[PDB]
Amino acid sequence: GISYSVEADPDTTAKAMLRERQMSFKHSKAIAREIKGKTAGEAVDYLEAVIEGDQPVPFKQHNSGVGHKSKVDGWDAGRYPEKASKAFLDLLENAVGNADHQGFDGEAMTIKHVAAHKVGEQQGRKPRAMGRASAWNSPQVDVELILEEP
Amino acid sequence: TELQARGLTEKTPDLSDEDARLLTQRHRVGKPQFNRQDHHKKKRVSTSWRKPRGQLSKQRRGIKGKGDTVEAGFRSPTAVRGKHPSGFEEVRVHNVDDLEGVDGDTEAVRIASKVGARKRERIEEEAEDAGIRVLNPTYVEV
Amino acid sequence: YAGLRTPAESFGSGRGQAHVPKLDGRARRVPQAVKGRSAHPPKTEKDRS
Amino acid sequence: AEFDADVIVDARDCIMGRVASQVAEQALDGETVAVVNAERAVITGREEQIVEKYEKRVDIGNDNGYFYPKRPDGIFKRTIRGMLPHKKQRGREAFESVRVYLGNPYDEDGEVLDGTSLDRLSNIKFVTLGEISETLGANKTW
RNA sequence: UGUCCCAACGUUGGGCCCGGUGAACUGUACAUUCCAGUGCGGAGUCUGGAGACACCCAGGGGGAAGCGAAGACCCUAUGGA
RNA sequence: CGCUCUAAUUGGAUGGAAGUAGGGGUGAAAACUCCUAUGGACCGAUUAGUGACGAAAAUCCUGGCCAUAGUAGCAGCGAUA
RNA sequence: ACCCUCAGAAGGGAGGCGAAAUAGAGCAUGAAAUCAGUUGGCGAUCGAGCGACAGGGCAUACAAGGUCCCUCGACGAAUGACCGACGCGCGAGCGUCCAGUAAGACUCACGGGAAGCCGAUGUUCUGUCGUACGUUUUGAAAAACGAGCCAGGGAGUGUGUCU
Ligand SMILES: [Cl-]
Ligand SMILES: [Cl-]
Ligand SMILES: [Cl-]
Ligand SMILES: [Cl-]
Ligand SMILES: [Cl-]
Ligand SMILES: [Cl-]
Ligand SMILES: [Cl-]
Ligand SMILES: [Mg+2]
Ligand SMILES: [Mg+2]
Ligand SMILES: [Mg+2]
Ligand SMILES: [Mg+2]
Ligand SMILES: [Mg+2]
Ligand SMILES: [Mg+2]
Ligand SMILES: [Mg+2]
Ligand SMILES: [Mg+2]
Ligand SMILES: [Mg+2]
Ligand SMILES: [Mg+2]
Ligand SMILES: [Mg+2]
Ligand SMILES: [Mg+2]
Ligand SMILES: [Mg+2]
Ligand SMILES: [Mg+2]
Ligand SMILES: [Mg+2]
Ligand SMILES: [Mg+2]
Ligand code: NA
Ligand code: NA
Ligand code: NA
Ligand code: NA
Ligand code: NA
Ligand code: NA
Ligand code: NA
Ligand code: NA
Ligand code: NA
Ligand code: NA
Ligand code: NA
Ligand code: NA
Ligand code: NA
Ligand code: NA
Ligand code: NA
Ligand code: NA
């Protein structure tokens, strides 16, 4: 698994991680990308709107065949990754919880750092025609989060 | 409170007029990188020089723009060849006994990397006292 | 006999594969293959005296 | 609108090509040039063949395109472009520091470059750019 | 008698957007190309011009002498059956 | 010039070996060497030997990995649930 | 271990052990291909063997390189004048003299200056040349053949006899 790739001052910082989550690594990049710089609280509301389908996640790199979304600003393609979103809400809930147990004001902390990493694949095999089989795998994602006082 | 290198770091060798000229030439003319053809087009191909052997190689054919081919004509002046940029001739040293016979006016010493701090300290202090500069000195806080 | 203990055969042309002996879809015997024979290995017969 | 031309060249009764060759030379030397009265510039030759050449150019084309100017305006500018490496930084810089105009929007009367002037009294086989543009179908906006 | 003149409208399942799942073919490199030329005589890459702001969605497949198969045709081998 | 192991001669290393990462110097070059970080136990030199001794290629072998792509499929069957 | 979080013997946070947890369980070291985040340089008007050699921008902790810039002056190979004087030519221009002079690459000396400053490295811009590599071939950039990328593996050996 990963380790925090960024230094964090413990006196003004709260940390959190997700380990080997089986979800879209591509969606996770997009989500991280989008919520970085946001307030843990703002992030929560955003991700919930995504899950609700009232807010699209800009898909800036893994966008092939993706249809345009009017709400995306400065870009075009976007979707509503609810699974990855839920995993991020779990990540945030933990971080904000850790932040409170330390005396900070969780929700108001800024997302200083947030990144997803593809730690592996749960390998699978799919039978195909002509007596042959081919991979059918699942990504495994790790993701770091660093909250910082404003 | 600040770092200072041990020994005669500033020491310079005394060279004949001819040698200093040849040294200055070497440094002025320089030479080509002489890296292997197309090393930059494929990662599996390293920089280490290999003679271009392809019958159609453009380098091998000496097409201008494809890089220089290694030739005797590129050799550096006999009199200076192998000299540290300072002009000193290097002498590889592993212990104190290696310092014996070294001409501090003409040669500078380079302590092998493997030698430990304990042995370095001794080599470094007796080197200085013999008027020999140490090319890779230890930096202590003074 | 190291690396020769097998009935690996090459499929020849036709499947976009190099003509390398294979068994159970695994390459074998030939020098360039992993688990294949050593081409010119040490020899008991050599007079080292 | 407003063009700090270091030079203002009057094309009236002058051989376009010759003028263009000089305006390019200067534009590459860093001069800002403005060519005036383009419509009155001239090109020697048998009108009929001269026109076929330009009419062909207009007809040439396809999806990728071959945009050929019809106004004496463009005609003259394209001619200058052909004398500059307009795709290189330096060349596009020069080309862009050059502008051709119908009539003269300046107060000063442009100068006449040496060896570009045509003697109507001793020349009958030649044509006006404006004449060519009219034939091409341009809109006589002059 | 929609085979045709000569196509139209409609029905169901796809196709398109969204959540979830999630391969393969293929990849020397570079690559926004077009017209001409040239070259081992069938060039996105040479030469000359022309055109060309970047990214993305959908399409029908013109080109990559597209992808797939060390040509079955033909000839050659002091080859095989 | 470089690699393995043997021998003689002779050195380095827990006051930090090999290796690896980045960086400085030398050699026309094969390649040699130093600095910092990592590492945490082995490593050289000269001479004379040794040989399963040097790779960009073989539709090469084995493993890992990127693009392909959040794409195809998860609709089509007289059993539409 | 204990405490917080969590649907939770999961995971995470905080904490404890040890020289070391970046030794935390397929756990020594931890390359490349390659992925996330990020720094430097370039960047939505522009052209493709991706570079070599020259030269500029921007960027750079120490270490292991320490040079570099401008005035002037010394030396100074081949080469080698302007102006002016005189004499030719229809003319472009030439001849003689001034003069093998002034100049002239490198190098050096005095004085002054730079420490991102010189070298070097990263990237990018300009100039010159430039259609991979290997193989087949009279001729390969080839619309001839091979490779997706990287690592590791991958081909003159032994005995006998002869020379
Ligand atoms: Cl993925
Ligand atoms: Cl030599
Ligand atoms: Cl057109
Ligand atoms: Cl150009
Ligand atoms: Cl006339
Ligand atoms: Cl010199
Ligand atoms: Cl051989
Ligand atoms: Mg789509
Ligand atoms: Mg079957
Ligand atoms: Mg390389
Ligand atoms: Mg074996
Ligand atoms: Mg064949
Ligand atoms: Mg037959
Ligand atoms: Mg037969
Ligand atoms: Mg010895
Ligand atoms: Mg080869
Ligand atoms: Mg493979
Ligand atoms: Mg597709
Ligand atoms: Mg029904
Ligand atoms: Mg480990
Ligand atoms: Mg072109
Ligand atoms: Mg032929
Ligand atoms: Mg190898
Ligand atoms: Na994209
Ligand atoms: Na938008
Ligand atoms: Na918008
Ligand atoms: Na067996
Ligand atoms: Na293959
Ligand atoms: Na024997
Ligand atoms: Na003319
Ligand atoms: Na046209
Ligand atoms: Na019908
Ligand atoms: Na097509
Ligand atoms: Na540079
Ligand atoms: Na071949
Ligand atoms: Na070739
Ligand atoms: Na060809
Ligand atoms: Na593949
Ligand atoms: Na071998």
UniProtKB/Swiss-Prot annotation, chain A:
Question: Which CDD domains does the entry mention?
Answer: Ribosomal_L22 (cd00336)
Q: State whether keyword Chloroplast applies.
A: no
What InterPro entries does its record include?
Ribosomal_uL22, Ribosomal_uL22_CS, Ribosomal_uL22_euk/arc, Ribosomal_uL22_sf
GO CC, any one term: cytosolic large ribosomal subunit
* Key words of the record: Ribonucleoprotein, Ribosomal protein, RNA-binding, rRNA-binding
Membrane-spanning residues = none
Pfam short name (any one)? Ribosomal_L22
Molecular function (GO) terms for this protein are:
rRNA binding; structural constituent of ribosome
Highest taxon of the source? Answer: Archaea
Record GO biological process: cytoplasmic translation
Its function, per the record, reads: This protein binds specifically to 23S rRNA. It makes multiple contacts with different domains of the 23S rRNA in the assembled 50S subunit and ribosome.
- What does the subunit section of this Swiss-Prot or TrEMBL entry state? Part of the 50S ribosomal subunit. Contacts the macrolide antibiotic tylosin in the polypeptide exit tunnel.
Q: This chain belongs to which protein, by name?
A: Large ribosomal subunit protein uL22
Provenance organism: Haloarcula marismortui (strain ATCC 43049 / DSM 3752 / JCM 8966 / VKM B-1809)
Lineage of producing organism:
Archaea, Methanobacteriati, Methanobacteriota, Stenosarchaea group, Halobacteria
Which gene specifies this protein's sequence?
rpl22
Curated annotation (Swiss-Prot), chain B:
Q: What are this entry's molecular-function GO terms?
A: DNA binding; nucleotide binding; rRNA binding; structural constituent of ribosome
Chain segments carrying region Disordered: 1-87
Q: Which GO annotations describe the biological process of this protein?
A: DNA repair; translation
Indicate, by first and last residue, each region the UniProt record lists as having compositional bias (Basic residues). 38-64
List all Basic and acidic residues biased stretches. Answer: 8-21
UniProt keywords (A-Z) are: Ribonucleoprotein, Ribosomal protein, RNA-binding, rRNA-binding
**GO cellular-component term (any):** cytosolic large ribosomal subunit
Q: Which domain of life is it from?
A: Archaea
- Answer whether the UniProt record assigns the keyword Magnesium to this protein: no
Q: Which residues form a coiled coil?
A: none
Assembly and binders = Part of the 50S ribosomal subunit. Interacts weakly with protein L15.
What does the record give as the function of this protein? Binds to the 23S rRNA.
Q: Which family does it belong to?
A: Belongs to the eukaryotic ribosomal protein eL32 family.
**What is the protein name for this chain?**
Large ribosomal subunit protein eL32
Query: Whose protein is this, by species?
Result: Haloarcula marismortui (strain ATCC 43049 / DSM 3752 / JCM 8966 / VKM B-1809)
Q: Which residues of the whole protein are included?
A: 96 to 237 of 241
From Swiss-Prot, chain C:
Transmembrane stretches, by residue range?
Answer: none
Give residue spans, biased composition: Basic and acidic residues: 42-49
Region Disordered, as annotated, extends over 1-49
Superkingdom of the source species: Archaea
Its biological function? One of the primary rRNA binding proteins, this protein initially binds near the 5'-end of the 23S rRNA. It is important during the early stages of 50S assembly. Makes multiple contacts with different domains of the 23S rRNA in the assembled 50S subunit.
The record's note on quaternary structure and interaction partners says: Part of the 50S ribosomal subunit. Interacts weakly with proteins L18e, L24 and L37e. Has been cross-linked to L18e.
Q: Which family does it belong to?
A: Belongs to the universal ribosomal protein uL4 family.
What is the name attached to this protein's record?
A: Large ribosomal subunit protein uL4
* Whole-protein coverage range: 51 to 99 of 246
Swiss-Prot record, chain D:
Q: What is this protein called?
A: Large ribosomal subunit protein uL13
Q: Which HAMAP family does its entry note?
A: Ribosomal_uL13
* Disulfide cross-links: none
To which protein family does this belong?
Answer: Belongs to the universal ribosomal protein uL13 family.
Q: Which GO terms describe its biological process?
A: negative regulation of translation; translation
Highest taxon above the source species? Archaea
GO molecular function terms noted in the UniProt entry: mRNA binding; rRNA binding; structural constituent of ribosome
Q: What does this protein do?
A: This protein is one of the early assembly proteins of the 50S ribosomal subunit. Binds to 23S rRNA.
- Subunit comment: Part of the 50S ribosomal subunit. Interacts weakly with proteins L3 and L6.
